[PDB]
From a paper:
Phytochromes (phys), first discovered in plants, are red and far-red photoreceptors that are also widely found in bacteria and fungi later. PhyA is distinct from other phys and is responsible for the very low fluence response (VLFR) under a broad spectrum of light and for the far-red light high irradiance response (FR-HIR). In higher plants, phys share a conserved domain structure consisting of an N-terminal photosensory module (PSM) followed by two tandem Period/ARNT/Singleminded (PAS) domains, and a C-terminal histidine kinase-related domain (HKRD). Then, we solved cryo-electron microscopy (cryo-EM) structures of apo-AtphyA, AtphyA-Pr and ZmphyA1-Pr at resolutions of 3.8 Å, 3.0 Å and 3.3 Å, respectively.
Interestingly, the PAS1 domains of AtphyA-Pr and ZmphyA1-Pr position differently in the low-pass filtered cryo-EM maps. Thus, the portion downstream of the WGG motif in the PHY tongue of apo-phyA becomes more disordered than that of phyA-Pr, facilitating the entrance of PΦB to its pocket. It is noteworthy that the tip of the PHY tongue in ZmphyA1-Pr also seems more flexible, as in apo-AtphyA. Considering the good alignment of GAF helix-α5 with AtphyA-Pr together with the less well-defined EM map densities of PΦB as well as the abnormal absorbance property of Pr conformers, we speculate that protein sample quality might impinge on the EM map reconstruction of a complete tongue of ZmphyA1-Pr. The PAS2-mediated dimerization interfaces are highly conserved between AtphyA-Pr and ZmphyA1-Pr. In contrast, because of a smaller tilt angle in AtphyA-Pr, only marginal interactions are established between these two structural domains. This is also seen in ZmphyA1-Pr, which has a tilt angle comparable to that of AtphyA-Pr.
Numbering used by the authors:
A (entry chain B): 72 to 110, 123 to 347, 362 to 537, 559 to 591, 743 to 1045, 1054 to 1125
B (entry chain A): 73 to 110, 123 to 347, 363 to 537, 559 to 591, 745 to 1045, 1053 to 1125
């Protein structure tokens, strides 16, 4: 690191000057600076003398105030020859470094700069980043790398990712055709030393022009007791080993940006780097570098948003299983009833199988070891781990179980639970497959390791332990993570939601430990009292409410629950024994008897976090009842189904009777278009509505393309007859009859959409010609040619931008056609020649 | 005064007094010994009077510190087991027990608690909780109707107290033959303040009969402390109350107070007064149920109070936005007369005028030019010191004239921007009249709506803006003729702006007040980095993410797209966090070159901010759902054209006659499908009115019924349901005139809903009858098993069933269509089967 700070070298693509703040006089200068700055500069020269007034005034004004990086690009004209330069000044402890870069004359009209030009060029890459739905890191990385690729034009663009063990993994990348990819690789922690990361925290952009270019030394004043550090400057020479490492990667001009993410003024850590590479020397102007840095910043912001979304998603699962536990405690849960009923031991935690040993009998679910070896497992647990109870591990071999060959490769992670000495519970998980490529290229495989058991997932099992043991009614139990061969002791705190109840006459009858903690009132001080008036009241009670309106609402809720209709999550709030306001969500379940007489209520409370209490819990209630559409044509979706069934039955009866080839082909065409109709309405499910591009799967089937083409013609031939146009399909017979494997319905929809567009846009007397090409995997090419004015420019531009909400019906439809086409690695090519319009469709199919 | 001194009770129940500690009787009613024993002198204990259970319960209830929680205590007397409700009150250091007879009508009352009283009145609460808010009259009507249904009294009203304590009958429900009293105002002296205090103490007052003589209570000679039975429900009526009761032609009554929080402090909104022509009795559980209903109504009043505040705040925000827009483009005094933001929308009025450059411009209803000159002269002469004035009235305002001029104008607001030029706002009078039952009337035709303080605040702001853009002393009398008050505010939003290079170039005074900085300390500095920066600046932001978002907002605004109401937050000079909304508008010169931005900041209250956030988050889901559904609606079209083509070919091709009917059924089904898609006509009106444009043409009913059957034959086969159609061939095939396409849907959706709930192995029987030219068509569809659930059956019986389920909606629409052509639907359930009877009127061919 000290060599980097104390080194005096620069790249030959610019010049460097050192000025004194109090005197504005040159102290040190680049060796090549006099040669193309005066095409004589010396120590103590005044920078005003050697630069023209329009630029010298700007430079002198910029040198004044401290925070000088606000207007960094200063276009400056040399007095001697009038060559344009970019002046970029960096503050330092008495150094005041200045960098001059040569402007590219090809964009000389770009005079007049500032931090506001060509960041309107990064506006597209920002406005299309914002439009992505969240929850998908891979999509965000793909979009970011693709936009950096498009903006900069470098060969390779990557998204280098740092893991918890500071080892790099290429998360996403894009590259020019004809270049070897590097996606999926993994790199050790020694590639990027801590000095590089410490520098990238400070200098967020690093750029190198040529790897083989010779560095230029810098001379300095002999009276300088303090060396001029070039750490701030962007003209610093490459370091003695970075050069060799990038030489081994066959790269020359790399451009590296750092992504800074809060560690979770918060502490901030590097999520990774954006690294652009090239094979030949390359140069980039300053505004593009600034725009890319700003793009990295907004990428980091969206990464933070993804972290918050993941935290909320993880938080909701606490409430879900708390509700499950409350439901399991509401009814008397026997060890027999738990295994059979719907809230079984297969949904308490995400597990691959479950088992139960009690009453000297064994029950299993899904995948579990047989009756023989499960008793040996119980015996081993009893002998080795006698005093401590509760075990969790992801590998029986790591613990040291002797007999595991009989179990097999599957069923590797084991979690146990002990209600008492004999009766015990089992959860069984299967080990996953891990595969990482190092390429320092060798393959590394790790087997027989299952997913780790989170302390949350053991707290759930502990709560189930307590519930079952209390219902059946061993002491001071302690469980182990078994992360390594050494055994460490848990401190598992249970979580059971606060629960209280009242009988049919309104007297309080239940007050458990969680409520005792929440309110502070011990059970003995609240029981045998009126629930509404003596315990919960706004005037004189143990837990005062906010106001009389809240008490009235609570009475309404309790009485309505006693009447038959049960609440699910009603927000309430009250003051505890210490006077602190508590806000929570209360739910009441009616309690009935065998004879059908209501005995009372059974209320339980879970308190979510403030962020979760607001978002999606108060803001959202069926989108806060966005019932605007719920009447308009929502009834149509239901009402159109029955006539569809009517004509399916009609077509079945039609095909039941004896018909020759001519009618059979038409019946097949009908059935094909009806299947297309059912398929398109199949996508109308809310699962594909919440996220439009969520499900992108296809139906594999064997089909003949001739039927697809015939139906495509027939779906628009009515309009063709209406406008009196002729459609000709010049397709070879032998190639058209060969079966293919794929989804002909989606290609059918796409073609038919293109034919509809062409027929609508072509006036009367026109012609449509469809030609087919089969290349041998089968490459299918379809050319549709028509005459007329062609597709209007506005619709073409609309259909070339998916994010455009101005999407006309034709434009939206064509965008969906391309989105479907991209699934099988297809592309649409539009050509306009002599006024004729040609559409080229490419597809890949599996030969039968 | 003597609200507690009177030792008289209405003889419909007994009363006893009990010592605080000894639990012994001191005083008893004169009729108590006869109704409780047949000695009842100074008895030793009340436990020996009643049987064990009741006596034990009464002793326990007397034991508790709080007694109001166990008011209904059913007790029995050992003499003959007469059931008595025993209500216990605890006041003035003594207990008072009231025993009301339990009528043998409802001998198994089984209430005995404050829980069955609620369940007596659950449906009314459910009705009130479903009403959309914002309308007080609908809530009053619903509450009074539910109370009328519950109690069963002849006459009921809601009695509303105004600010001057004069009471108005806001609503009323009466049985036929009773003179209505709606809207008749009453003097404020009808209700003395003692009654209001009692109603704030006791929420129920009930009188069985106003003519029956009262009886007294025998007090203990030894005791020297009065019972003071003020809190008991057996208190006798007051004499003047009796006179006003007989004045109102009511003989029995029961009233309940409505207490709402006043803006914790609470006040009496009014009463819910029930009246009868003959003496009536109501048992205690019904009284408690109605009191709880009154409490629910009082709860629901407060949110209607809050909605008005939210509306007012939104209006203030909108006018601030209008003021900012007016400042955005330099507005000359001559630009507001004809431009889009004219002086009409600033404050509600009926006309406007302007006098600039000795030229007069008028808008909407306003006096003539000479009258404008005379008003200007009188304003200059009489009030020369004032520069802003507003009179609700002009005849008595001190202006000689405007009497024979007329013009139907009373209110006038005038603002003086400069020495000799003024704006105008003319307001026409509203016909106001009140009617006093005790009838007479008071009519005022010379007073308009008053000038609100905020409506003058707007005028002051507009005057300031115009004076500033044309370019001290601030006096503004807003009293008509007698009063004089002054000191209005600007309420101009905080405004700032940045040059095209990012340099700050404008800092409003309101912004100075909001942030604490000064214009000279912030001008000519970079807006992003030196003024609004996350690390070292004048007004620090929360974090780097907020700074990046603000940079994105400003740069996007400079690019030609404007942001409105984007939430931001920052620390002021004193370290106080401020959360507000920012809106940026691009500023473009007349040559087509932009020259910076122009930002202004709203500061809504927390509740309004929460509501705005909720609505802004909610609208997006509806937008995307609409977009997706429109795509789906368009994309349906393509394959139906192909199916129609193919069916046309099949019909064209030579085919036997037996499939002619099959192809016809298909085509009928397809055109029926086309019908609903063609029903994009403004959310079809349906109901009885609906669209009377039903297809009028000849057809065959048998084909329609066959198509309807085939529409559900697939589901019938799936579930293995056997369908029998016993239709007479001669009658079923007879030609008729009318609509058959809609009838197909009417029979098909009913068949589908019958099939859906059909148990496995069930059977469906369909019969058709023709009555005789006009033919009455009767279709009976019978299926076994339970049948349609009661919820869907009710939701088909009527249309007011909250949100409507898909099958329920379909059946509703079917009922509307049936009612269109004089048809009706009847459902019968007898011994585990459901049958639907469908009646239609058709014209025979
Ligand atoms: C004589 C001194 C004045 C007087 C005295 C008085 N009034 C009350 C109580 C009530 N007055 C009521 C008035 C109305 N009832 C109606 O039918 C309507 C309107 C539709 C009116 C104006 C009512 C009702 C009450 C409240 C009690 C109730 O029974 O509901 C009292 C107190 C009596 C008591 O002992 O509680 C007194 C002393 N009222 C008058 O109007 C005359 C001029
Ligand atoms: C020298 C013996 C070791 C070494 C030293 C070293 N490396 C850097 C900096 C970088 N190395 C990078 C590596 C990668 N980028 C990629 O695209 C890939 C793979 C596809 C990898 C692994 C990156 C990134 C940098 C930064 C480049 C930049 O321009 O800053 C440094 C710091 C140099 C400096 O600028 O101070 C040093 C000392 N790297 C090695 O792996 C060898 C063994």
């Amino acid at each position: 690191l000290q060599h980097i700070q104390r080194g005096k070298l620069i790249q030959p693509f610019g010049c460097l000057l050192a000025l004194d703040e109090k005197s504005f006089r040159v102290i040190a200068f680049s060796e090549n600076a006099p040669e193309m700055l005066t095409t004589k500069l010396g120590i103590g020269t005044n920078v005003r003398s050697l630069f023209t007034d329009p630029g010298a005034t700007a430079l002198q004004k910029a040198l004044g105030f401290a925070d000088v990086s606000l207007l960094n690009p200063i276009l400056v004209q040399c007095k001697t020859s009038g060559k344009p330069f970019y002046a970029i000044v960096h503050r330092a402890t008495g150094c005041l470094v200045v960098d001059f870069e040569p402007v590219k004359p090809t964009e000389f009209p770009a005079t007049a700069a500032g931090a506001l030009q060509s960041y309107k060029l990064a506006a597209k890459a920002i406005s299309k980043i914002q439009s992505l739905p969240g929850g998908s890191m891979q999509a965000l990385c793909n979009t970011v790398v693709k936009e950096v690729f498009d903006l900069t034009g470098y060969d390779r663009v990557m998204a280098y990712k740092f893991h918890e063990d500071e080892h790099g993994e290429v998360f996403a990348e894009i590259t020019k055709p004809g270049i070897e990819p590097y996606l999926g690789l993994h790199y050790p922690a020694t590639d990027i030393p801590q000095a590089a990361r410490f520098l990238f925290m400070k200098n967020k952009v690093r750029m190198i022009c040529d790897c083989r270019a010779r560095s230029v030394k810098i001379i300095e004043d002999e009276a300088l007791s303090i060396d001029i550090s070039l750490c701030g400057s962007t003209l610093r020479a490459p370091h003695s080993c970075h050069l060799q490492y990038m030489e081994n990667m066959n790269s020359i001009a790399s451009l590296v940006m750092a992504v800074v993410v809060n560690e979770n003024q918060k502490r901030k850590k590097l999520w990774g780097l954006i690294v652009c590479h090239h094979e030949s020397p390359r140069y980039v102007p300053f505004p593009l570098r600034y725009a890319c840095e700003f793009l990295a910043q907004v990428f980091a912001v969206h990464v933070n948003k993804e972290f918050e979304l993941e935290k909320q998603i993880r938080e909701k699962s606490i409430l879900r299983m708390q509700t499950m536990l409350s439901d399991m405690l509401f009814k008397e849960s026997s060890p027999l009833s738990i295994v059979s009923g719907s809230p079984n031991i297969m949904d308490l935690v995400k597990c691959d199988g479950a088992a139960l040993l009690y009453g000297d009998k064994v029950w299993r679910l899904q995948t579990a070891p047989t009756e023989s070896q499960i008793r040996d497992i119980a015996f081993w647990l009893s002998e080795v781990h006698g005093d401590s109870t509760g075990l969790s591990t992801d590998s029986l071999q790591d613990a040291g179980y002797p007999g595991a060959a009989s179990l097999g490769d599957m069923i590797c992670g084991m979690a146990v639970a002990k209600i008492t000495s004999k009766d015990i519970l089992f959860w069984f998980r299967s080990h996953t497959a891990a595969e990482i490529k190092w390429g320092g290229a060798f393959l590394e495989v790790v087997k027989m390791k299952s997913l780790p058991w989170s302390d949350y997932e053991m707290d759930a099992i502990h709560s189930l332990q307590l519930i079952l043991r209390g219902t059946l009614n061993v002491m001071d139990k302690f469980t182990r993570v078994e992360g390594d061969y050494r055994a460490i002791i848990h401190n598992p705190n249970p979580l059971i939601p606060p629960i209280f109840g009242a009988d049919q006459f309104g007297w309080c009858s239940e007050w458990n430990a969680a409520m005792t903690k929440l309110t502070g009132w011990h059970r003995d001080e609240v029981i045998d009292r009126m629930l509404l008036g003596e315990v919960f009241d706004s005037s004189n009670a143990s837990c005062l409410l906010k106001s009389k309106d809240a008490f009235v609402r609570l009475c309404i809720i309790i009485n309505s629950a006693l009447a038959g209709e049960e609440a699910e999550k009603a927000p309430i709030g009250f003051f505890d024994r210490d006077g602190k306001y508590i806000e929570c969500l209360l739910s009441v379940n009616r309690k009935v008897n065998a004879d059908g007489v209501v005995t009372g209520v059974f209320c339980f409370i879970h308190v979510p976090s403030d962020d979760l209490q607001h978002a999606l819990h108060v803001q959202q209630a069926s989108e806060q009842t966005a019932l605007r559409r719920l009447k308009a044509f929502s009834y149509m979706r239901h009402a159109i189904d029955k006539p569809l069934s009517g004509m399916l039955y009609s077509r079945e009866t039609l095909k039941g009777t004896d018909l020759d080839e001519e009618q059979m082909r038409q019946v097949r065409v009908a059935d094909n278009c009806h299947r297309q109709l059912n398929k398109i309405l199949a996508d109308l499910d809310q699962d594909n509505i919440t996220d439009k591009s969520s499900c992108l799967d296809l139906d594999m089937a064997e089909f003949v393309l001739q039927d697809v083409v015939v139906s495509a013609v027939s779906q628009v031939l009515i309009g063709c007859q209406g406008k009196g146009i002729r459609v000709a399909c010049n397709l070879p017979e032998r190639s058209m009859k060969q079966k293919v494997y794929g989804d002909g319905i989606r290609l059918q929809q796409i073609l038919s959409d293109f034919l509809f567009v062409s027929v609508k846009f072509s006036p009367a007397g026109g012609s449509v010609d469809i030609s087919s090409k089969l290349t041998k995997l089968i490459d299918f090419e379809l050319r549709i040619k028509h005459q007329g004015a062609g597709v209007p420019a506005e619709i073409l531009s609309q259909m070339y931008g998916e994010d455009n909400r101005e999407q006309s019906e034709e434009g939206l439809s064509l965008l969906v056609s391309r989105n479907l086409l991209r699934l099988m690695n297809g592309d649409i090519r539009h050509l306009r020649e002599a006024g004729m319009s040609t559409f080229i469709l490419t597809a890949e199919l599996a030969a039968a």
